[PDB]
């Protein structure tokens, strides 16, 4: 049979070489082309164990972003250890895409075929492929954009629901549209986010129908964050090069007992932020002139359960989670695992 | 060895707000979550919440909430504990807790095999 | 949310004699012994509602039957006096004091 293993994987994407886009330039000298027959073999009588929580697979992408990261972003002044640096700062093309990693010879990728897989344990249906699909690098807190969605219902995962400390990671079903503007010409830091109203709540009443499974006849409630870095407190994200922060209030503030408008999140772009790929300050020129706006779709969240007791009893509280980018590549990645064919 | 030390004990007024520290050194600080544990005088073990270093994720039990922040200096390897309007009632020892497994991908947060020495905090008029 | 019942309130002992600590549970969770000696910090005796902590000498033994978790101190030293918490995550039982002397 096979034995799990930890193998260096190679990537590959759709890279253009004509593009000046950061993304585009990173995979170009570390990636191969896409696979035009790629070649997955379904396994009969298999029962495989995958553990989305100890995957090794998420620890060389985590690598691979944290490069991509330093080598492309200018910072105008970056601290780290105590030390500051001053450098040019000009604006660079920033749009993720999709990249996909590779098993060398004498090495395969184990597939998860089970559409309700909790993250953990054994797996009836099970396949063989070469690569991964197309995994988009995307660096965001609270909700995961731009990913895969859930191909029946929606996926509740954590390593374990009734430890508090554990990172809750959302999977839905059904993509939610997320349109980020600033506007073109008054404060050029100001941006807002259109989420509609209906399309979200419904996703919500459907979360807490799933995390009632765990927590029987229970009260969901989804509140605001209870503090931290405003990376973490808010709702990050990158938009034509420009660091987004959205209050997510909104968004997270709403009770769902045993039973078409807009929601406009307000936003900043700043300039000073925390470094996610190592532990320091970085500094950034202000937002360029013209209208800065993109569209994502929200095929996920992280969320932290609330400890301790409740004066009334009977009500769990979820808040929008994160400060660990591994959860990122994790909510991705949880369906594979690196083998060896030997 | 891990090594979690705290500041001197506290006389505070009814009313005042107070900031208690947790030096950290033996492991990588980055690692795992900071525990804040009370103990009111001749009372039992009360959790007051979670803080984690990496990016000062927090969470609180509902009677902490509003009067309880928990925030870190990743330059010195310090977790703070800081709480406002101070009662009579929150005379205690507040203690710091790591959990005993911690590595770079992975923790248990409750078996609490490091403790602080404990910082008394005592609120009078 | 979880609700740990520690029993009996006070233990009066002495040295050579054994210690029969009880905690009830209904629920999920690993379980958790420490010791409290006076004016200091508590310690871990036992994790995983079986297992013995760093420098946890054999003499101090943590076992389950069913919703029923004890912890027993064979062979009792002046040392094992003090306040004995069960914990599950971030619940605590109240105590029981164990009173051994010289």
């Known amino acids: 049979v096979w034995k799990e293993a930890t193998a260096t994987l190679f990537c590959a994407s759709d890279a253009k070489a004509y593009e000046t886009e950061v993304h585009n330039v990173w995979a170009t000298h570390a990636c191969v082309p896409t696979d035009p027959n790629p070649q997955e073999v379904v396994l009969e009588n298999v029962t495989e164990n995958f553990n989305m929580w100890k995957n090794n697979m998420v620890e060389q992408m985590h690598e691979d972003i944290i490069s991509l990261w330093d080598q492309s972003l200018k910072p105008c002044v970056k601290l780290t250890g105590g030390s500051v640096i001053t450098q040019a700062c000009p604006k660079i093309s920033f749009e993720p895409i999709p990249i996909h990693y590779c098993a060398p010879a004498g090495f395969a990728i184990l597939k998860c075929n089970d559409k309700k897989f909790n993250g953990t344990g054994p797996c009836t249906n099970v396949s063989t492929v070469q690569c991964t699909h197309g995994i988009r690098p995307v660096v965001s807190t609270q909700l995961l954009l731009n990913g895969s969605l859930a191909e029946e219902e929606i996926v509740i995962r954590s390593e374990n629901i009734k430890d508090n400390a554990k990172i809750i990671i959302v999977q839905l079903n059904e993509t939610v549209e997320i349109n980020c503007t600033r506007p073109n010409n008054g404060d050029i830091r100001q941006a807002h986010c259109n989420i509609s109203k209906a399309k979200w709540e419904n996703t919500l009443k459907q979360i807490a129908r799933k995390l009632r499974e765990h927590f029987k006849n229970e009260t969901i409630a989804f509140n605001q964050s209870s503090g931290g870095d405003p990376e973490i407190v808010m709702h990050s994200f990158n938009c034509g090069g420009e660091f987004f922060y959205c209050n997510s209030t909104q968004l997270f503030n709403s009770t769902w007992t045993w039973n078409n408008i807009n929601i406009t999140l307000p936003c900043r772009i700043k300039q000073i932020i925390n470094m996610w790929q190592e532990v320091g300050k970085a500094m950034y020129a202000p937002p360029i002139k013209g209208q800065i706006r993109c569209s994502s779709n929200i095929t996920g969240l992280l969320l932290t359960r609330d400890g301790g007791s409740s004066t009334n009893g009977t009500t769990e509280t979820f808040r929008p989670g994160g400060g660990d980018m591994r959860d990122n590549w994790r909510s991705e990645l949880y369906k594979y695992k690196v083998v060896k064919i030997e | 060895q891990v090594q979690l030390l705290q500041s001197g004990a506290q006389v505070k007024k009814t009313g005042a707000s107070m900031r208690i520290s947790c030096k950290t050194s033996?492991?990588?600080?980055?690692?795992?979550?900071i525990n804040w544990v009370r103990q009111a005088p001749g009372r039992g073990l009360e959790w007051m919440g979670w803080?984690?270093?990496?990016?000062?994720?927090?969470n609180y039990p509902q009677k902490f909430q509003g009067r309880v922040t928990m925030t870190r200096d990743m330059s010195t390897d310090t977790a703070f504990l800081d709480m406002s309007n101070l009662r009579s009632d929150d005379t205690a020892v507040y203690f710091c807790?790591?959990?005993?497994?911690?590595?770079?991908?992975?923790?248990?947060?409750?078996?609490?095999?490091?403790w602080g020495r404990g910082t008394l905090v005592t609120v009078s008029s | 949310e979880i609700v740990l019942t520690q029993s009996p309130g006070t233990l009066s002992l002495s040295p050579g004699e054994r210690a029969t600590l009880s905690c009830r549970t209904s629920?999920?969770?690993?379980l958790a012994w420490y010791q409290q000696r006076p004016g200091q910090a508590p310690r871990l005796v036992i994790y995983?509602?079986?297992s013995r902590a760093t420098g946890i000498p054999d003499r101090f033994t943590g076992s389950r039957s069913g919703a029923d978790y004890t912890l027993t101190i064979n062979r009792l030293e002046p040392e094992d006096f003090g306040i004995y918490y069960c914990?599950?995550?971030?619940?605590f039982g109240q105590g029981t004091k164990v009173e051994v002397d010289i």
């Open positions: 914990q599950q995550y971030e619940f």
């Open positions: 995983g509602g079986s």
């Open positions: 803080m984690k270093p990496r990016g000062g994720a927090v």
């Open positions: 629920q999920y969770g690993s």
């Open positions: 807790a790591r959990g005993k497994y911690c590595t770079a991908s992975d923790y248990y947060n409750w078996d609490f095999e490091h």
């Open positions: 033996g492991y990588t600080f980055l690692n795992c979550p």
